[PDB]
Amino acid sequence: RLDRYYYLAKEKGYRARSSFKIIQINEKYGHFLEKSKVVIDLCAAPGSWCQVASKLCPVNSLIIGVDIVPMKPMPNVITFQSDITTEDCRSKLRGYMKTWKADTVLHDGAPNVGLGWVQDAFTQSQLTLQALKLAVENLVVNGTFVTKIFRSKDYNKLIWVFQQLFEKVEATKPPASRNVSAEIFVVCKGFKAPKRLDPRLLDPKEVFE
Numbered sequence: 001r002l003d004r005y006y007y008l009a010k011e012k013g014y015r016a017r018s019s020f021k022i023i024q025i026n027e028k029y030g031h032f033l034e035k036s037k038v039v040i041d042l043c044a045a046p047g048s049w050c051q052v053a054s055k056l057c058p059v060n061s062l063i064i065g066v067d068i069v070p071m072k073p074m075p076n077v078i079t080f081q082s083d084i085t086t087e088d089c090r091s092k093l094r095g096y097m098k099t100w101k102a103d104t105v106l107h108d109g110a111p112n113v114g115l116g117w118v119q120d121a122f123t124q125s126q127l128t129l130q131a132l133k134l135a136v137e138n139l140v141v142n143g144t145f146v147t148k149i150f151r152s153k154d155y156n157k158l159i160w161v162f163q164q165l166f167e168k169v170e171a172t173k174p175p176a177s178r179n180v181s182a183e184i185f186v187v188c189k190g191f192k193a194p195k196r197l198d199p200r201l202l203d204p205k206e207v208f209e
């Protein structure tokens with residue numbers, strides 16, 4: 001909570017304790033950030049995962065962060081304000097991406113407005129599906145997708161959809177997540193980059209019953 005990771009992150013200049021979650025996931029799952037010349041960070045504010053990517057990615061990497069709340073600028077990182085569930089976000093990201101494909105798409109989204117446990121879990125699951133849809137549109141073949149996901153009655157359905165689009169799909173809970181009961185992280189590796197993509201594979205009405 002206000003624990004060891006909170007204060008280490010402060011002292012190192014990271015904007016949030018959650019910096020350690022992606023550092024630890026990256027260290028266990030093959031240092032994908034060090035291999036990523038283009039990174040999209042979804043639901044990024046205040047921006048500590050963007051800071052991690054800025055530190056670990058090759059120099060001259062393209063790092064793009066998006067959140068509903070404004071983020072303070074970071075050197076050599078692009079940030080903008082949008083709702084990742086919207087066409088607005090879909091269009092702004094495409095302008096920054098130009099002809100590039102992303103090596104890695106990160107997602108650490110969670111609802112801001114509390115609506116009770118059941119609906120907060122569903123909002124988070126909807127966020128995760130939208131983040132996945134953006135990753136499917138932007139990832140290079142064999143790219144990586146890392147997402148926070150809440151434990152809920154829709155977790156299994158999201159995992160299944162992930163397994164249709166990635167060679168390897170693994171749940172993880174790094175040390176900096178140990179005492180955060182709601183959350184698991186899913187590392188998706190080897191984006192299949194299908195020529196034929198099913199609209200239903202990413203349709204919320206089909207995924208969520």
Ligand SMILES: C[S@@+](CC[C@H](N)C(=O)[O-])C[C@H]1O[C@@H](n2cnc3c(N)ncnc32)[C@H](O)[C@@H]1O
Nearest residue numbers: 043045046047048049067068083084108109110
């Ligand atoms: C857990 S924080 C992300 C922390 C970030 N990984 C870091 O290290 O600084 C979750 C963020 O998701 C954002 N969020 C929730 N729903 C969103 C949406 N629909 N579109 C964009 N951002 C959203 C919230 O504004 C919040 O900033």
